[PDB]
Ligand binder design. Sequence first.
Ligand code: FAD
Ligand code: FAD
Ligand code: TRP
Ligand code: TRP
Lengths: 614, 614
Amino acid sequence: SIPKEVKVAIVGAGMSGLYSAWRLQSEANVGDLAIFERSDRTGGRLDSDLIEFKDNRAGAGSTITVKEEQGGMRFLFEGMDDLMALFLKLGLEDQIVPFPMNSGGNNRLYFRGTSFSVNDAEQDDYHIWSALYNLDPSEQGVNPKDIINVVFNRILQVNPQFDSRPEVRGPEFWQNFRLQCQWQGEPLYNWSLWDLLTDMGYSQECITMLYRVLGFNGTFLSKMNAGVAYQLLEDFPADVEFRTFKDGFSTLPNALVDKIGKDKIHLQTSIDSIAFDKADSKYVLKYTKIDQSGQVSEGKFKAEKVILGLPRLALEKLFIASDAFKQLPKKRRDELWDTLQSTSNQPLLKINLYYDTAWWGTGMTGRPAVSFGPNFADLPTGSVYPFYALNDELAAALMYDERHATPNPDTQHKLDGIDAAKYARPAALTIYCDYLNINFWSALQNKGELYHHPHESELVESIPSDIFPASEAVVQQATQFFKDIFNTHYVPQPTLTSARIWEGNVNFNVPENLQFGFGVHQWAIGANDKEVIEDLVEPLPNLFTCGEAYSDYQGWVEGALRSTDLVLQKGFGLAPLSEVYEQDQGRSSSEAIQIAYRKISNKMIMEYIDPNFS
Amino acid sequence: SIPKEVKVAIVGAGMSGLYSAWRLQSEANVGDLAIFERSDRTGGRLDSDLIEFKDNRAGAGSTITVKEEQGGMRFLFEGMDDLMALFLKLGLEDQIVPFPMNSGGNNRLYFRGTSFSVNDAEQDDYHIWSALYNLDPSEQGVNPKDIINVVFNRILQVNPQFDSRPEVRGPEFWQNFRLQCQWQGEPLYNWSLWDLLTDMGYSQECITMLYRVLGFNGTFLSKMNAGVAYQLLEDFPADVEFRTFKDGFSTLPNALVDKIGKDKIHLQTSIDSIAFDKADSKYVLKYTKIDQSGQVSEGKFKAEKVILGLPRLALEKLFIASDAFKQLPKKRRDELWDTLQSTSNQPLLKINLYYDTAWWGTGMTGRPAVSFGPNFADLPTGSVYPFYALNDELAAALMYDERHATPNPDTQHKLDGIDAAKYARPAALTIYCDYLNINFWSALQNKGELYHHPHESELVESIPSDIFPASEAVVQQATQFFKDIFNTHYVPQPTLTSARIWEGNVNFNVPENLQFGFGVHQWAIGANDKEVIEDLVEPLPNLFTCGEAYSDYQGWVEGALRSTDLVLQKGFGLAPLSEVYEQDQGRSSSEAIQIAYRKISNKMIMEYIDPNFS
Ligand SMILES: Cc1cc2nc3c(=O)[nH]c(=O)nc-3n(C[C@H](O)[C@H](O)[C@H](O)COP(=O)(O)OP(=O)(O)OC[C@H]3O[C@@H](n4cnc5c(N)ncnc54)[C@H](O)[C@@H]3O)c2cc1C
Ligand SMILES: Cc1cc2nc3c(=O)[nH]c(=O)nc-3n(C[C@H](O)[C@H](O)[C@H](O)COP(=O)(O)OP(=O)(O)OC[C@H]3O[C@@H](n4cnc5c(N)ncnc54)[C@H](O)[C@@H]3O)c2cc1C
Ligand SMILES: N[C@@H](Cc1c[nH]c2ccccc12)C(=O)O
Ligand SMILES: N[C@@H](Cc1c[nH]c2ccccc12)C(=O)O
């Protein structure tokens, strides 16, 4: 049942769509809204998986849960005040769990046919990098990642007009940085990073090292401008304490869905086009719906206000097919289209391979054990992240670890046993790559038969619906690369796999369960994103756009939430959530979230690690 | 003056547009046609330049001509029977001139921070490649280009069903090869080359070597399928005798324009959209024209038949905006759009830097002199081609050279003097790159002020209109790379520059003199190009498409001519030009063109080189 008129119609059940409805329902008393989502699931580019593997250990119908991510995975307590506030208001802070990013130096590196570890790379004044890359002398004997840091310091040094001092560096800093800082008279958003480093005098060998060693070469090789690329590159300092949700980032959209109500969300309902009814001053939304049989249905309805929570490629399709846009004057319709072109589409992929046990610990490799964080490579792999079966004791050990406490031998010995025990429980690896590496996996994933371990139903009885298997060719090649990266002869066959390629499609011959938007977005060269962002709040009267694609904080949910807030302000009077939080609570969401988390971490550690802890 | 009705309306004054009109006028007696071309020039992706530099030598108002290319540059006597026939029928064979591809081993190579020569690369069982790349043992001690050749032989070996024997290997061979040959059960057009080599067991180091060393990494990293990539990679054997026109490839479109008549060609006239008139069974073409003042004008006219000689991106724009397409049923309109998606857009660029004299000869470098052919590099340069001032004696020396004659000391000594004298006359370098390297130059060319040598009008009085200067940033970086590639401290400032980036635009904020289509196209993965090609001849009744993008021979003018021929056959009864030639002349265009050229080469050599020649 689809209503025939609504106060607010919400296109997109991703984060910005779900977030608009919750805030309008609860803070603006608007109850006659509806969300329309083309796919058969809510959450968009957030998509966690919970697999319940048959516990087939020796002394075991017992079940073991592994959380994995097909989309978004991590967040931070600083710089995401809207997201923190959103977590606190939904009471989801008790589920917050560490997301660690290193293995004390044992994370892997594979570059130019050579497998080694992070600790290895540091030896002898970072010698290995000088042996693999034909570096200029000024480029030798330093950690590659510190070259990005130094160049940032140099950009800040020659831009004293730009304040450069707020200890917490949020989206305003990064907007001003890319819009106000210059290099040699040209502001950074007119620069490509590749051009920038080159003009700074770096070798092409050095630039290739950097974009391979950071794992996400889009920052250098795509059309994104240099300013926004730095925002992304300085999002992962050495000392990052990322966090995540125990049951996966989907916890947050599902939690919003409980509060919205399944009855106002209309899945498998694509909004095909939008027209304006001059008579009763209403929008008219043509749609296409698939029921629970597969029986299609074209229909139409009205709405006083429209909210498009949609990324760039979705927004161009509607614009193309919508009379509300086509009947605009030549000048502004062309200007609006050109404005959609101002953020670059960034392809991303994640392929998850699950295993009954993990094979990258010292017991299986004979080498120092790999635990957590990106294993980078110049192979099509890009980066590889390990994921372990959910375990309360392990999360407390991780929680102890993000305190830089000095354990006594008793506690070091218990942390030892915990670090090792996880390799005996099921686990997973995510291959996570961007720009240059996409086409390698693309062609591989679409060729040949799909991968299924035999007696698969014996290994998992309930395979989630958002899981499309990796192709046999994808598993085959991914397995050779793992042997390379982890320097081991032994990489067994996965029990279960999923492949997800966030790269937007314009082909009508693709099932809906395989249509996915561009993984992330970043501002192109020449883009004045301050003008672009404000133009796209309400481009036609009572028609709004918002979401991550044209946001202040591209790449992150906070981008979507801050973009939506502009719509909720301009169209509905609502102040930014973080500001609403602070008036209501008397402290920031930052301080609240840190205090709440320290408490449950304090309790977790004492309960599991060191009964006599600080 | 634009007619209000025509028998045939031709959209696009590129090669396929101009070729349709000439053949319809002359062979089908159709005189009431008109060509409509959005830009202010004919010829499309053919675009030669003739610069007339002030001869400021010591013993000189004398003029020196340099030919250069912003688009297409070379062709072959075998495998391009339509093009040869077209040359013979227009009497352009007397202007055919060698296009040499090597310097006897002195062409440059720059890979991983190391500058060296082709002769150097051969030393010690191709050792240099093993020192620069971490190759598998089976990948060591062989010439990189011979790895592509061997893999081709292997593909042919395991496909004995595929005949694999015609000595002249034309578009049919390459269509059957990519459509009928398989690797491990999957046919090559379902494969990416990158996936293919990997599955064959090659290292990523080796694959990176290959795609850097061949200069056009699109074959490996883009979405083009493996079969069509091989067609391109085996277009440049070691023994290639390419040829070109003395005054540039534009000779051919200009020669067609003389025969069509400027009066039937309507420049600065974009066809915006197309509708069907059910009443008088006519198409209705909305257009936009700019007169000689800049005064725009929107109009409309009719035509009984429409011929779209347009590449993919142009074809999608019309399809989007045209009622003749939108009023098609849901199924076929979506099927037709999906069919447009089946050829991949391949960006290309050419930046030409002209110099008063050439600086890469031994007199200026102290190293073995560079003459002709690609200087490849893993720098954003890609490939660099030298171009010299037009000189009849030099072309005869080149003509002698494509005979593998053994000159006597008298003739070797005269060839010596000729080889060296060209460095004293003006010359040019073309940077010619694809896929991965485009974005480097893109962002550079659009940033900052444009390059002009001071007292430029003193150096060239008549700067052609199709020449947009290289940006100052482009010249600056291109000059550093030249010092790298040519291993010299000394690369002076260019007298004149041009930049051309064949990468299709969808932004309305770009002048017409800067809108250019995708440089070339190649079949994507999954594309059954036999079905696609025949579907796009006449997709609606009396509406035809043709050109290179969805052709049998992508990359080359012959592709455009063979694609058009299908339209001229199905819509107008005309047999393929090469077949028309043969009936009329009693021999192929291949044999005619070889015999005609041998004669004028025979005469050229005797006149300039060795009076007593074979
Ligand atoms: C691989 C990957 C990893 C990431 N990791 C992180 C991370 O660690 N941390 C972080 O903060 N962020 C991360 N992100 C980013 C985060 O996922 C996004 O910023 C955010 O979830 C996107 O929200 P959105 O509402 O802007 O868009 P979307 O999530 O893309 O929502 C758009 C929705 O609209 C629907 N839709 C489209 N067209 C129509 C139509 N015509 N009618 C109806 N519905 C339509 C789509 O199906 C989709 O559900 C990651 C993204 C990717 C791809
Ligand atoms: C860098 C480069 C080098 C090349 N080198 C070679 C080579 O050495 N040898 C070789 O054989 N080939 C070469 N080619 C390929 C060759 O240039 C092309 O195959 C051929 O010239 C293209 O002809 P076409 O008619 O298919 O398309 P185009 O040349 O692209 O013609 C399309 C024309 O239609 C016009 N147009 C577009 N939309 C509209 C509209 N709406 N209304 C009116 N007019 C419109 C465009 O302005 C253009 O003039 C090269 C190409 C490039 C880019
Ligand atoms: N938050 C993202 C990082 C990211 C944002 N935008 C991107 C663009 C390209 C590559 C990575 C990113 C992640 O967890 O991975
Ligand atoms: N004929 C083209 C070669 C070519 C055709 N298609 C291509 C695609 C990519 C790179 C090169 C090509 C040339 O002279 O350069």
